[PDB]
Amino acid sequence: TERVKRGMAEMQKGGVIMDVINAEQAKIAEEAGAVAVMALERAGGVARMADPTIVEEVMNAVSIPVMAKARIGHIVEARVLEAMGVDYIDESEVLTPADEEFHLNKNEYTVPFVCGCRDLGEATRRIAEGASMLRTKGEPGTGNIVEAVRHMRKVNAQVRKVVAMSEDELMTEAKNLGAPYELLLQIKKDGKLPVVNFAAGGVATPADAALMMQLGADGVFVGSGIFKSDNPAKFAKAIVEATTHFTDYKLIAELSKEL
Amino acid sequence: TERVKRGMAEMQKGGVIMDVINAEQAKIAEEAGAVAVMALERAGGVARMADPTIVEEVMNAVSIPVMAKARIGHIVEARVLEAMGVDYIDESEVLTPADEEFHLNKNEYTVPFVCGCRDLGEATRRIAEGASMLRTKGEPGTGNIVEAVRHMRKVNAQVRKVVAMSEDELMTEAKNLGAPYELLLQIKKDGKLPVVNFAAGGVATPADAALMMQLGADGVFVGSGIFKSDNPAKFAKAIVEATTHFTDYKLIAELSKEL
Amino acid sequence: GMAEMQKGGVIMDVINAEQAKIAEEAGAVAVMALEGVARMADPTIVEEVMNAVSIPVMAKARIGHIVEARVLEAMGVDYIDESEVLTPADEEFHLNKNEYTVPFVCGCRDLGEATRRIAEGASMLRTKGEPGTGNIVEAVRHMRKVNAQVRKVVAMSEDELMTEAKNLGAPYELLLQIKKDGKLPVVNFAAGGVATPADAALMMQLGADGVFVGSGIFKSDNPAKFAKAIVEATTHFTDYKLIAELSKEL
Amino acid sequence: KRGMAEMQKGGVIMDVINAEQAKIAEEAGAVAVMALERGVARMADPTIVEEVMNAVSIPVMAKARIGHIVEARVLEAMGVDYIDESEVLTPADEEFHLNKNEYTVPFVCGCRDLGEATRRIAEGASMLRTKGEPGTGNIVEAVRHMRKVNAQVRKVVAMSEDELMTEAKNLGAPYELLLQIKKDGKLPVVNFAAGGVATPADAALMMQLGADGVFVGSGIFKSDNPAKFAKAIVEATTHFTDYKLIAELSKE
Amino acid sequence: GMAEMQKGGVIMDVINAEQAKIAEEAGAVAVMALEGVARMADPTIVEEVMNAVSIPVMAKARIGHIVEARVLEAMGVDYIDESEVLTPADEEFHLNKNEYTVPFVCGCRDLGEATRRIAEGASMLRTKGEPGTGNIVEAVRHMRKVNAQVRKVVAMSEDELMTEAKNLGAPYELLLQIKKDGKLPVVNFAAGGVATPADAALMMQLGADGVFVGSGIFKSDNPAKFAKAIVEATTHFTDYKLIAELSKEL
Ligand SMILES: [Cl-]
Ligand SMILES: [Cl-]
Ligand SMILES: [Cl-]
Ligand SMILES: [Cl-]
Ligand SMILES: [Cl-]
Ligand SMILES: [Cl-]
Ligand SMILES: [Cl-]
Ligand SMILES: [Cl-]
Ligand SMILES: [Cl-]
Ligand SMILES: [Cl-]
Ligand SMILES: [Mg+2]
Ligand SMILES: [Mg+2]
Ligand SMILES: [Mg+2]
Ligand SMILES: [Mg+2]
Ligand SMILES: [Mg+2]
Ligand SMILES: [Mg+2]
Ligand SMILES: [Mg+2]
Ligand SMILES: [Mg+2]
Ligand SMILES: [Mg+2]
Ligand SMILES: [Mg+2]
């Protein structure tokens, strides 16, 4: 059921999801206040689904939801993670795509998916294929927030326009966006996207995390840079507190010290 | 209600709809076995909605459904015909378009609409805007069946492909067609379009009418050429009998004589 | 303030006293006095119309023609239309309407053009439409474009407005004020190609503040009746039973 | 279907619009006639076709627009001997030709090259002709088409068999047909000249270039003596190397 | 008929007797004996593999290399792969495989290529994939393309098939037979880039008749175990619990 899958996804709203490679990192994230973890194994090589042993370790390490990545289009990687009992699958462009023409028919799965998007056409096509959660594609591993900004702004600007525009112009808008019409109509009616949309890819600092929230993100994904710090527990907790208290500029100043 | 509007439209299936300019022609069409008539007023000029007096004359002349044309996008021509009690509105590219960017939001009307289409993307966008019936755009006033053939074949070929293709390829197909995704999915599930699709524009002979049926049309629209004959009643009845008995080649030979 | 007084109305092109009186009698809110290079009308025609009615009288000046506009002002016209239908006198600069006492109407096709005309001092706008074709399609295009762009401006994040202004070629402070007011600061009428009662009502349904119609009124066998039909359809633009009856015999 | 087409081999087929023209053609030695009505050009009034069929004892052909299923089915039902799925009529389908395989009546189709030829055959054509250039009286395009087809067959028949798929891909020819052409040393159906034959010398030229026969148009009946002209064309086509005879036929 | 016997199986690239036996023991349906210009393998290697197992043995010939293919045939290989991974000997013409007694496998990327290879005499097909990258994306592309094109051919109106054949560059009579049979006349295996148990099962889910895998099996610390994991995932391609367990430690 759609309502279940989305309701589950919606639970994470206002929070931070962290990339973790083992039980130790998993525990640190949970302890810092992460609402979930993304289990990762992460040179010209092919990036695939993680060794299921790693995903299993992470699932055993924490009580918060655990996510993992499947290559775009990789039906079997996705069915495997589903059978393993992960809480969410990220059909991720950061892994090497298995299918360069067709995304997964996520509607046919019981596990909820997260997908990336850069604009409202991509967002609505991912939702129509059955995505229960969205995120910016951003710019992974660069530490530059600029693409996550661009994507969150684009999606949000396009939503505002759709909500405000004459209803009889929406088919032309759907055609121009490559958006499924019925989803745009429902967006107009609801005044919002039907799923949460997190920032992801390039969130490097407390100020970055708070910025994405200020731009309308529903939460934040952060990467392994957390555990490149001299004190991952402090850094992880700093990202959590900035994402939550995203208008407390005195706090965020303090949190931004010694990075 | 959608189901009502479509069910009404679906009633005309297997039949001939004829363009008529007055009560006399209206009566001849009905008498020849037409399932409906299209009331028409039809030089570099602007072609608009018919004088309501003409539409009224036609509605008074016959007991079969009466259709009339509104310019593409002309909200008020359409609301006027609706208020007048016509049975269907044809939002027609044969009249001079009032809006070159946006079609009518046909969903907001109580009267059913017919729209033209040339391919499945156009068909599904017209349906999504609320069209209850479709037709080929054909090539009006030329008497050349070639475009009606092309459009009926295109729509039908694209439907067959959609019905047969892997479900997980349908979003890519929707994107390529500019088709609303949920409508394609439902087409795949139903094995057919959700509304009837008539041939229109260039049906000149009994053999033409039977051809469109053989190509999968749900019925035929014919133009004023009927009443350019020496014996409109005979010609109109010939078109009706060919459309119905579209595999009776001996009959169609006979009907094709003295044209 | 005087322009907004006309809102919901019909303005009729008239060439003489007789036409002008008919227009007034039909319920026109104003008349546009009218008369190869197309220039300002003979002042004699404009004065004939001014003396013939009590409703506001407008007249046309060539784009950029300072002296035509100052002459009309001196004549006591109520509004000047700086009109692209006359032959432009200046192809690079519009009039600085801020420097005149008489209010101006200008044409526009999009919100950039609208706000530039306003910033130059326009007190009233209209679509450029497509004059003398009887085809409503361009008026529809222009009215939809301006209105669509306004809705987006009203809805969008304030911090994205400067990019929008730069994209539109809009004066930023007008765009900001549009966002704050929820609308344009001046009325925007449909013009160019309104041929039928249904067309007039259509432009109102699309968000127009009123309608300019042309000399085709007087081409009909019963001008007064046709003039009245346009007025009644423009006012009562959602009364489809009325509009049906008015659409008969044109 | 093919053996019947082949019985026309070496003869002249004439366009005729009525029973009189039809009788003249038969009497002149035509092997068959093409019933015509002669703007959208469609299947002829069946009345005309029936008049022609009733007028002569030689085979009667008629035309159907390209892709017009029901026109072709109607002609079939009327008992015509052959249908010409003809580009000289206004095409009813600009994307797809008739599935001639599904009919009992034999079809003739036009072609300009061996790729077209084999595609038409694969769709079920029982006879081919050049497309030529109808109503110009200019033989040049019939020459082009007959030469092209025949040159491509000579090459196919002579070439290395392991090179035939590349040839088929290049021609857009169905591979099995090309392979059988190579095996047989020839096309599997007769191929007539059509479109622009104006003089006896033209008729004989087409045969000299390898045509199996000749289609000719209404120009025969535009002449001062149709019977004599028609006979001239028949004789020049049959006696296509008799240059003294063709000389005499070419007078007046 | 002999090719179809392999359906559902795994074929493994092997360079010597030892690898060959492991492959056989793992449940391979056949082995591909393998050894700058890349040519036919030293016949010594091919014979070593033929003597080492009882399952079918395939070997590679350069595209168009008549004599390499005749030599392999004379040697008693069970199948010849006319392979684009070797350096083509003829860049214009493939082998006339119709003239050989031994069955051939050929690569294809679309249904045009598939039917041309078949018409030349291929008894078996595979994707061209993207060899030695471990990236499954091109095998996915090719298998999806061929299968999508077949479904369309099977569904489409028969009278539109000649346009389709011309568009595809497909021999018409094969396309017609595909429509009638509902499928290709030969098996079509995935090849080039299958790296993991999940990849192998994915290609089966996409409609492949079987899977070719490369020397990466023997790069693992436990070849026999890995070989078995690929076999079991290819057969039991919808058992996600098994496939999960098999995906561990690669
Ligand atoms: Cl996309
Ligand atoms: Cl990142
Ligand atoms: Cl469209
Ligand atoms: Cl028509
Ligand atoms: Cl400007
Ligand atoms: Cl006008
Ligand atoms: Cl062709
Ligand atoms: Cl000719
Ligand atoms: Cl090829
Ligand atoms: Cl490989
Ligand atoms: Mg858990
Ligand atoms: Mg950059
Ligand atoms: Mg009635
Ligand atoms: Mg054309
Ligand atoms: Mg006054
Ligand atoms: Mg135009
Ligand atoms: Mg006979
Ligand atoms: Mg030439
Ligand atoms: Mg052996
Ligand atoms: Mg690539």
> What's the rounded Cα separation, in Å, for the pair B78 and C248?
15
Under 8 Å between Cβ of B227 and D51 = no
Residue C166: burial class (beta carbons within 10 Å; 0-12, 13-18, 19+): exposed
- Would residue A14 be called left, alpha or beta, if left means φ above 0 and alpha means ψ between -120 and 50 degrees? left
* Pairing status of strand D60-65 against strand C30-33: unpaired
Residue B160 in contact with partner chain E when CB distance is under 8 A: yes
| Count of C-beta atoms within a 10 Å radius of residue A214 | 12
Contacts with B49 from chain C: Cβ below 8 Å: 196, 198, 247
Put the strands of the sheet holding A220-222 in their side by side order.
Answer: A197-198, A133-136, A113-117, A88-92, A66-71, A36-39, A16-20, A220-222
Q: Which residue is associated with the tokens 């999606």?
A: A155
Extract the tokens encoding C200: 């007039």
Q: How far from chain centre, in Å, is Cα D133? A: 13
Q: Note the ligand closest to the C-alpha atom of E20.
A: 19
Which residues are B36's β-sheet partners?
Answer: B17
Residue B228, phi then psi, degrees to nearest 5: -90, -10
- Give the pairing type, strands E57-62 and E79-83: parallel
H-helix or E-strand containing B57? helix B52-61
**Closest by Cα among C166, C126, C111 to C32:** C126
B156 CB near a chain E CB, below 8 Å? yes
> Binding site membership of A for D-ribose 5-phosphate: which residues?
19, 141, 202, 223-224
Nearest to B50 by CA among B66, B28, B30: B66
Side by side, which strands form the sheet with B16-20? Answer: B197-198, B133-136, B113-117, B88-92, B66-71, B36-39, B16-20, B220-222
DSSP annotation string for D87-107: TTS--S-SS----GGG-SS-E
The C-alpha atoms of residue C29 and residue C231 are separated, in whole angstroms, by 9
Mutate to test the interface with E, among A41, A49, A80, A111 (most CBs of E within 10 A): A80
Helix (H) or strand (E) holding C93: none
**Phi-psi label, residue A68: left if phi above 0, alpha if psi -120 to 50, beta otherwise:** beta
SS3 C184: coil
Contact residues for E193 (Cβ-Cβ < 8 A; gap 6+)? E129, E130, E131, E133, E134, E135, E136, E137, E138, E139, E199
Handedness of CA E141, E147, E151, E157 (dihedral sign): positive
Residue type, A151: H
Query: Is B217 within 8 Å of B199 (Cβ atoms)?
Result: yes
Burial class (CB within 10 angstroms; exposed 0-12, middle 13-18, buried 19+) of A258: exposed
Residues 6+ apart with CB under 8 A from E68: E39, E40, E61, E62, E89
Rg of chain C over Cα atoms, rounded to whole angstroms, equals: 18
Give me the torsion for CA of D96, D102, D107, D108, rounded to 10°.
40
State the Cα angle at C139 between C111 and C17, rounded to 5°: 115
* The D12-16 sheet, strands edge to edge: D191-192, D127-130, D107-111, D82-86, D60-65, D32-35, D12-16, D214-216
Q: Give dist(CA B185, CA B173) in Å, integer.
A: 11
Cα(D195)–Cα(C148) distance, rounded to whole angstroms? 59
Q: Which of C209, C215, C179 is nearest to C195 (CA)?
A: C215
> Residue E32 belongs to what H/E stretch?
strand E30-33
Q: For the domain with range C1-250, which CATH number is right: 1.10.260.40, 3.40.50.2300, 3.20.20.70, 3.30.70.260?
A: 3.20.20.70
Specify the DSSP element, H or E, that contains C96: none
Cα separation, A156 vs A216, whole angstroms? 7
Test mutation, B54, B80, B104, chain C, max C CBs within 10 A: B80
Mapped onto helix, strand or coil, the DSSP state of residue E15 is coil
Binding site residue list of C: 13, 132, 144, 193, 214-215
CB contact at 8 A, B10 and B134: no
Give the resolution in Å: 2.1
**Among all residues of chain C, which has the CA nearest to that of B70?**
C198
Per DSSP, the three-state class of C186 is coil
The ligand placed nearest to the CA atom of residue E200 is 10
8 A C-beta contact, residue A197 and residue A117? yes
Contact status of B128 with chain A (Cβ, < 8 Å) = yes
CB D16 within 8 A of CB D51: no
CA A37/CA B100 separation, integer angstroms: 50
Judge contact between C211 and C11, C-beta under 8 A: yes
To the nearest whole angstrom, how far is the Cα of D46 from the nearest Cα of chain B? Answer: 6
Across the beta sheet with C30-33, what order do the strands follow?
A: C188-189, C124-127, C104-108, C79-83, C57-62, C30-33, C10-14, C211-213
Residue D85, strand partner residues: D64, D109
Contact E80, E58 (CB under 8 A): yes
Give the three-class secondary structure for B125.
Answer: helix
Known binding residue D3? Answer is: no
H or E stretch at C32: strand C30-33
Residue from E60, E97, E145, E179 carrying the catalytic annotation? E60
Q: Which of B215, B257, B250 lies closest to B235, judged by CA?
A: B257
A contact chains, 3+ CB pairs < 8 A = B, C, E
Where are the strands (E) in chain D, listed by range? 12-16, 32-35, 60-65, 82-86, 107-111, 127-130, 191-192, 214-216
Please name the member of B157, B166, B169 whose beta carbon is closest to the beta carbon of E160. Answer: B157
Angstrom distance (rounded) from CA E30 to CA E12: 7
Q: What secondary structure letter does DSSP report for C5? A: G
Of B163, B166, B169, the CB nearest to E155: B163
E117: DSSP letter: H
| Overall CATH class of domain B1-259 | alpha beta
Q: Which two tokens stand for residue A248?
A: 């407390």
What's chain A look like in SS3? CHHHHHHHHHCCCCCEEEEECCHHHHHHHHHCCCCEEEECCCCCCCCCCCCHHHHHHHHHHCCCCEEEEEECCCHHHHHHHHHHCCCEEEEECCCCCCCCCCCCCHHHCCCCEEEEECCHHHHHHHHHCCCCEEEECCCCCCCCCHHHHHHHHHHHHHHHHHHHCCHHHHHHHHHHHCCCHHHHHHHHHHCCCCCCEEECCCCCCHHHHHHHHHCCCCCEEECHHHHHCCCHHHHHHHHHHHHHCCCCHHHHHHHCCCC
Helix, strand or coil for residue B134? strand
3-state helix, strand, coil in chain B (%, to 5): 50, 15, 40
Q: Which two tokens stand for residue C5?
A: 């007084």
**Is A99–E137 a contact, with Cβ atoms under 8 angstroms apart?**
yes
Domain boundaries, chain B: 1-259
Residue reference for tokens 């002609």: D75
Compute the distance between CA of residue C225 and CA of residue D136 in angstroms, rounded to an integer. 61
Q: Is C218 left (phi over 0), alpha (psi -120 to 50) or beta?
A: alpha
Q: How far apart are CA C134 and CA C195, in angstroms?
A: 5
Measured CA to CA in angstroms, residue E44 lies from E14, E53, E55 at distances of: 13, 15, 18
**Active-site residue set of B:** 69
Of D56, D81, D87, whose CA–CA distance to D5 is shortest?
D81
Contact B151, B137 (CB under 8 A): yes
Q: What is the dihedral of CA C121, C125, C130, C131, to 10 degrees?
A: -80
CA-closest candidate to residue A168, choices B91, B9, C109: B91
Cα(B46)–Cα(A115) distance, integer angstroms: 50
CA pair distance B26, B38, nearest whole angstrom: 9
B89 and B67 in contact (C-beta within 8 Å)?
yes
Q: Do D92 and B142 touch (CB under 8 A)?
A: no
Amino acid making up residue D106: P
Dihedral sign, CA of C196, C198, C201, C203?
negative
**What size, in residues, is chain B?**
259
According to CATH, what is the number of the domain D1-252? 3.20.20.70
Say how far apart CA E131 and CA D46 lie, in whole Å.
64
Check if the beta carbon of residue D142 is closer than 8 Å to that of residue D110. no
- The single-letter DSSP state of residue C13 is E
C-alpha distances in Å from residue C221, one per residue of A84, C216, C217, C225: 82, 11, 9, 9
Contact B89, B78 (CB under 8 A): yes
Is the Cβ of C155 closer than 8 Å to some Cβ of chain A? yes
Token pair of B20 as six digits:
């008529």
Q: How far apart are CA C17 and CA A28, in angstroms?
A: 89
**By the 8 A CB rule, do D41 and D84 touch?**
no
Sequence-distant (6+) residues with CB within 8 A of C235 are C8, C9
Q: What's the maximum distance between 2 C-alpha atoms anywhere in chain B?
A: 56
DSSP 8-state assignment for residue B97: P
The count of C-alpha atoms lying within 13 angstroms of the C-alpha of D115, restricted to the half-sphere facing its C-beta, is 13
Per DSSP bridges, beta strands B113-117 and C211-213 are: unpaired
Alpha-carbon gap, residue C205 to C200, rounded angstroms: 9
Map tokens 């030229």 to a residue.
D205
At position B24, the amino acid (one-letter code) is E
Asked whether the beta carbons of E87 and E62 are under 8 A apart, the reply is yes
What separation in Å is there between the alpha carbon of B48 and the centre of ligand 16? 15
Count Cβ atoms below 10 Å from residue A66 Cβ, excluding itself: 24
DSSP state of C125: E
The answer to whether the CB of B85 falls within 8 A of the CB of B59 is yes
What DSSP state is assigned to residue E127? Answer: E
Q: How far is CA D111 from CA B146, D131, D147, D220, in A?
A: 21, 6, 12, 24
Give, as one character, the DSSP assignment of residue B62.
-
Nearest to E115 by CA among E65, E66, E173: E173
For chain C, helix, strand, coil in percent to 5 are 50, 15, 40
